[PDB]
Amino acid sequence: MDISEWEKRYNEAYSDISKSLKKVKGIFVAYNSNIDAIKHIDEDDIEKLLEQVDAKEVQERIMEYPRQIDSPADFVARLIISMRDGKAAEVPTYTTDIHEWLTDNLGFDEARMGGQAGIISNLLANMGIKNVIAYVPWLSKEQAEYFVDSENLLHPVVENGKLELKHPKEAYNPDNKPKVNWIIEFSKGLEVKFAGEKIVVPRDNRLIVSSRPPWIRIDMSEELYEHLPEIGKNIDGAILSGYQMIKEEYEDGKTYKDYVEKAVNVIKRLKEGNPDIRIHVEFTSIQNKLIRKAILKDIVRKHVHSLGLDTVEVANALNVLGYEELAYSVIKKDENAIVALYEGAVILLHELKLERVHVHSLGYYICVVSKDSPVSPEDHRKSLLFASTVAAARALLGNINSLDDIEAGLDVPVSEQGYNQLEKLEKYLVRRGICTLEDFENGCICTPNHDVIIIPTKVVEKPVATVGIGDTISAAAFVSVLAKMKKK
Amino acid sequence: MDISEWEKRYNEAYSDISKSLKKVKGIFVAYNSNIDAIKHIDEDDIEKLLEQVDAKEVQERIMEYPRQIDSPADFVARLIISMRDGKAAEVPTYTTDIHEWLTDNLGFDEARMGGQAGIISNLLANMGIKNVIAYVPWLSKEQAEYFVDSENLLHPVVENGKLELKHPKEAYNPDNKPKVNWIIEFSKGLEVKFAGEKIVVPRDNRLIVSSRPPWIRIDMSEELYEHLPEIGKNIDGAILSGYQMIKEEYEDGKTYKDYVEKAVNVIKRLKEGNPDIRIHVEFTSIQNKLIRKAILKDIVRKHVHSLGLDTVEVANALNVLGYEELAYSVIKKDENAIVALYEGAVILLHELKLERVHVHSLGYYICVVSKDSPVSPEDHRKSLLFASTVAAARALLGNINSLDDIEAGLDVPVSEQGYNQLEKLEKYLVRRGICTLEDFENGCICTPNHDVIIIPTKVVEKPVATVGIGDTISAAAFVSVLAKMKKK
Ligand SMILES: Nc1ncnc2c1ncn2[C@@H]1O[C@H](COP(=O)(O)OP(=O)(O)O)[C@@H](O)[C@H]1O
Ligand SMILES: Nc1ncnc2c1ncn2[C@@H]1O[C@H](COP(=O)(O)OP(=O)(O)O)[C@@H](O)[C@H]1O
Ligand SMILES: [Mg+2]
Ligand SMILES: [Mg+2]
Ligand code: NI
Ligand code: NI
Ligand code: NI
Ligand code: NI
Numbered sequence: 001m002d003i004s005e006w007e008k009r010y011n012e013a014y015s016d017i018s019k020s021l022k023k024v025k026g027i028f029v030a031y032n033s034n035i036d037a038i039k040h041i042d043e044d045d046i047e048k049l050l051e052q053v054d055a056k057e058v059q060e061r062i063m064e065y066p067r068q069i070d071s072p073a074d075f076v077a078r079l080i081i082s083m084r085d086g087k088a089a090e091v092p093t094y095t096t097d098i099h100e101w102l103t104d105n106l107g108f109d110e111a112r113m114g115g116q117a118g119i120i121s122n123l124l125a126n127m128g129i130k131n132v133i134a135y136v137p138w139l140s141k142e143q144a145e146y147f148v149d150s151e152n153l154l155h156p157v158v159e160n161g162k163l164e165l166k167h168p169k170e171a172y173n174p175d176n177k178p179k180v181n182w183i184i185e186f187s188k189g190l191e192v193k194f195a196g197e198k199i200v201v202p203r204d205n206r207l208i209v210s211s212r213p214p215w216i217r218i219d220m221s222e223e224l225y226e227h228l229p230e231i232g233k234n235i236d237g238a239i240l241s242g243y244q245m246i247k248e249e250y251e252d253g254k255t256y257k258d259y260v261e262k263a264v265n266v267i268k269r270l271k272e273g274n275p276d277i278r279i280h281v282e283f284t285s286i287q288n289k290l291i292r293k294a295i296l297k298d299i300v301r302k303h304v305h306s307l308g309l310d311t312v313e314v315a316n317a318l319n320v321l322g323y324e325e326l327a328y329s330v331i332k333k334d335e336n337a338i339v340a341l342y343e344g345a346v347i348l349l350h351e352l353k354l355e356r357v358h359v360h361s362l363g364y365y366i367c368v369v370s371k372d373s374p375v376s377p378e379d380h381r382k383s384l385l386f387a388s389t390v391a392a393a394r395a396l397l398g399n400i401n402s403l404d405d406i407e408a409g410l411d412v413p414v415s416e417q418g419y420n421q422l423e424k425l426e427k428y429l430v431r432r433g434i435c436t437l438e439d440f441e442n443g444c445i446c447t448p449n450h451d452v453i454i455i456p457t458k459v460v461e462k463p464v465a466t467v468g469i470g471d472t473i474s475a476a477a478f479v480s481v482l483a484k485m486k487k488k
Numbered sequence: 489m490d491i492s493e494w495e496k497r498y499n500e501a502y503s504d505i506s507k508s509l510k511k512v513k514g515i516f517v518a519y520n521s522n523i524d525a526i527k528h529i530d531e532d533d534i535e536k537l538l539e540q541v542d543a544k545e546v547q548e549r550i551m552e553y554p555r556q557i558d559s560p561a562d563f564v565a566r567l568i569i570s571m572r573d574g575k576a577a578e579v580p581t582y583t584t585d586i587h588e589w590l591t592d593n594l595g596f597d598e599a600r601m602g603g604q605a606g607i608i609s610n611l612l613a614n615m616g617i618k619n620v621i622a623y624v625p626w627l628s629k630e631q632a633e634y635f636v637d638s639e640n641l642l643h644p645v646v647e648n649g650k651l652e653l654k655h656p657k658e659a660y661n662p663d664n665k666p667k668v669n670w671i672i673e674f675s676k677g678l679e680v681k682f683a684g685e686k687i688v689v690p691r692d693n694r695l696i697v698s699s700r701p702p703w704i705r706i707d708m709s710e711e712l713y714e715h716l717p718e719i720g721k722n723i724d725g726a727i728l729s730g731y732q733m734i735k736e737e738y739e740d741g742k743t744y745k746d747y748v749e750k751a752v753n754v755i756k757r758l759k760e761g762n763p764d765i766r767i768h769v770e771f772t773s774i775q776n777k778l779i780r781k782a783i784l785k786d787i788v789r790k791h792v793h794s795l796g797l798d799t800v801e802v803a804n805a806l807n808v809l810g811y812e813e814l815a816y817s818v819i820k821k822d823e824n825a826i827v828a829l830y831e832g833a834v835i836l837l838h839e840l841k842l843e844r845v846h847v848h849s850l851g852y853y854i855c856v857v858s859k860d861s862p863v864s865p866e867d868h869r870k871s872l873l874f875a876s877t878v879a880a881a882r883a884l885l886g887n888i889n890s891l892d893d894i895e896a897g898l899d900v901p902v903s904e905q906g907y908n909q910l911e912k913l914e915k916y917l918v919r920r921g922i923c924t925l926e927d928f929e930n931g932c933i934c935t936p937n938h939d940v941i942i943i944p945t946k947v948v949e950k951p952v953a954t955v956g957i958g959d960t961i962s963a964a965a966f967v968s969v970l971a972k973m974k975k976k
């Protein structure tokens with residue numbers, strides 16, 4: 001009916017946060033960075049691959065379906081399978097050699113920074129934030145190419161006797177190669193003569209080779225470890241992600257338990273240098289539920305102050321936290337879904353003792369905040385509106401290059417789908433007595449146990465790129481909250 | 489009979505070590521630095537002091553003899569006492585205010601760096617050693633004046649967010665004042681009219697005000713503490729001293745036990761950054777025997793690899809270590825004294841599990857070394873000869889300004905007093921079967937449990953300044969031993 005009021009609030013939110021970000025003195029962004037590479041393969045390309053491999057071996061490899069890529073024949077065998085069988089597929093490789101072979105023999109059309117940390121790192125860099133300290137384990141020369149040249153963006157490197165911060169381009173170790181994901185795309189009509197058989201592809205499809213090298217872990221050098229307090233002293237918060245690449249078993253005697261214990265120490269060391277620091281964790285899909293549970297309960301729960309996740313991820317968390325039914329209700333897409341999203345969010349806040357849980361969905365955001373939070377509900381609302389604007393711009397333009405680009409997102413309309421979805425929640429919360437019609441249309445809802453802030457968002461109908469928007473949403477909000485709080 | 493052979497060895501030792509010191513990559517020198525100030529007071533000076541104080545108060549202070557200087561009246565009262573009574577005396581002050589009053593109202597004729605660390609710091613600086621990292625708790629602007637401007641000499645300072653090494657002159661905290669000792673000297677015939685009484689001084693005498701401020705302790709900032717491994721990584725050894733200023737009781741709830749525990753952590757942290765590091769402790773007179781015992785047993789014994797002390801100090805250590813008789817025998821000055829010195833040194837090596845115990849006496853040096861030492865007895869002998877030469881030069885010239893000054897000490901004769909003292913030890917050790925006449929006149933004595941190196945030294949008959957020679961002796965030897973060992 002009236003988004004005009006929401007629209008004014010959006011403008012106030014943008015101006016206030018734009019100015020306030022000057023106050024953030026530094027932010028440590030760590031762990032999962034990688035290169036996503038895309039290649040559309042034609043016939044001339046396939047011919048060069050076959051020129052590099054033995055057909056007898058590939059046919060033998062094809063007979064026994066391979067569940068991993070270790071040799072260039074494994075690649076071709078899987079590639080041919082997914083070429084003839086219509087279905088798409090993702091296959092992992094546990095070596096960096098595969099990427100190198102592909103680079104030397106195939107090429108890629110486009111490449112882009114990937115991973116939650118690397119994206120947030122570049123985002124906050126172009127956003128003008130001071131002291132963006134990124135950390136990528138075993139950073140390589142190629143990886144650093146995909147960081148941006150900003151004076152405010154740094155990375156730790158050891159200069160023969162001292163640990164120092166330099167730009168990513170000047171901080172790599174020549175002895176490592178990078179984690180790169182290859183997405184291979186082919187199209188209807190592709191003809192290939194293999195082993196005398198002729199294969200023509202029925203429909204468009206993509207193949208994904210996902211590098212998951214076992215040596216890249218949630219760990220850091222002793223030099224860096226002992227410098228945590230000095231880093232923490234000089235930043236206002238940290239954004240931590242990538243915990244999904246911890247495995248149950250590591251061949252060198254380590255287990256998931258050891259890297260949970262390491263993760264928590266990293267957080268505690270940071271707090272040793274700055275007791276007022278605020279740690280955010282971006283959550284994501286974690287196939288293995290034993291690990292998901294440890295990440296949430298063992299790591300995230302009492303040591304982290306802020307968590308960011310999408311709708312589905314709330315269900316993943318609830319599911320391993322003892323609420324199978326409520327997870328089932330959020331996953332169903334019907335009217336009740338947003339009622340279950342709300343209550344679930346409220347669960348996560350208490351069960352995991354956090355300052356704030358930020359859930360970003362398609363047409364709206366929902367943030368539940370503890371009563372002992374250092375910033376006000378009004379400020380939090382300013383932060384979601386800002387994050388909503390940043391997401392509009394990034395969807396419009398493909399990427400944020402400056403703090404001014406963000407203003408283009410103010411001109412994306414508040415989504416009607418999202419606004420009407422809140423209407424369902426509005427009725428529920430009013431009837432519950434939790435809420436008054438005035439307080440909800442305000443977007444600020446206060447309750448003895450917690451406050452909860454809901455906004456409708458600006459949704460782009462023909463967006464340029466949908467990669468890293470969710471990561472962007474959580475980062476932009478967390479720093480906005482960091483700007484708002486104060487210190488002497 | 490033949491020092492000519494010793495003389496050749498001295499020359500070989502100097503050339504070899506002179507060249508080898510290039511190899512020491514850094515050395516951390518920490519804790520006790522201070523300013524020693526000397527003032528000869530005439531009558532015009534005393535008159536200004538009385539012009540600043542009330543006679544009635546000083547006379548009242550004089551009636552009740554004061555055992556500490558807290559007020560400028562306390563100073564004058566003690567000063568007058570020691571002026572009329574012939575005897576010399578040392579009186580402590582527990583504030584830095586006393587120094588300031590004296591500076592503003594009295595002046596001093598000469599001042600010089602003092603303390604074991606500060607002296608060794610400047611010594612190794614002028615000696616050309618790379619990376620001399622000094623550490624003085626609550627370093628002040630005046631204190632830093634007395635460090636020398638050498639590019640190789642540094643000190644830790646925190647620059648608003650980062651811990652860094654700068655020169656002492658640029659690393660002070662404007663908010664601290666320095667530990668300074670005032671030595672006041674007066675002479676026969678001094679006339680002073682106080683309270684109507686006239687005082688004339690009978691004989692020359694000095695008064696010493698020794699600043700012992702309770703806030704200067706054997707501790708360091710958290711920033712520095714967390715940077716120990718990075719420092720240790722970049723030095724080959726550390727020289728630690730000043731443990732004598734730990735008190736039983738500290739008014740803020742701390743006790744000697746806490747600073748022992750801190751001292752040992754400092755050593756362990758350093759070893760975390762460099763496992764091959766070698767720690768030296770220079771020992772000194774420690775009036776309180778409970779503390780002396782803790783320093784030796786609780787701190788020095790298993791965590792330190794090298795100890796340096798004078799003849800008397802060996803007796804102090806033996807005494808609190810359970811050997812009262814052997815301590816009594818070294819203190820007696822008779823022929824047996826050097827037999828007891830030897831055996832005592834051997835005691836200290838085993839009872840305290842060290843790599844080497846270096847005892848420097850007036851005409852000779854005695855170093856007992858464990859069998860698992862990283863450097864050879866021959867090399868050790870080179871180190872004592874070098875240290876003996878450095879001590880000759882410093883006694884000649886008052887101070888070491890360059891690595892070339894050391895060569896002047898080669899031209900100071902081997903002491904006959906010292907050589908003949910060894911003759912007694914030679915007979916004992918031969919008759920003991922420990923030794924063969926050839927092995928002793930060689931100066932290298934090997935034994936199942938330990939090796940022991942004895943040399944005669946170069947002693948100056950009209951020396952310029954005898955302050956810090958012993959500290960110099962131990963430092964020069966320890967670094968010489970550090971130069972000799974090897975690492976990749
Ligand atoms: N066209 C769009 N305009 C604005 N926001 C969008 C658009 N498409 C997706 N989003 C936001 O991006 C989020 C997707 O992030 P998520 O599912 O967590 O994956 P990722 O974190 O990899 O981006 C959604 O929660 C949604 O709010
Ligand atoms: N004239 C001199 N020439 C050479 N060496 C000397 C001379 N006088 C003293 N020494 C050496 O200096 C040492 C004195 O040091 P010590 O008694 O430990 O006090 P400090 O450490 O304060 O100098 C003696 O062991 C002696 O070997
Ligand atoms: Mg996401
Ligand atoms: Mg001494
Ligand atoms: Ni092609
Ligand atoms: Ni450092
Ligand atoms: Ni657990
Ligand atoms: Ni005078």
Ligand code: NI
Pocket residue numbers: 163227230650651
């Ligand atoms: Ni540092």
Ligand code: NI
Pocket residue numbers: 781782785786
């Ligand atoms: Ni003890």
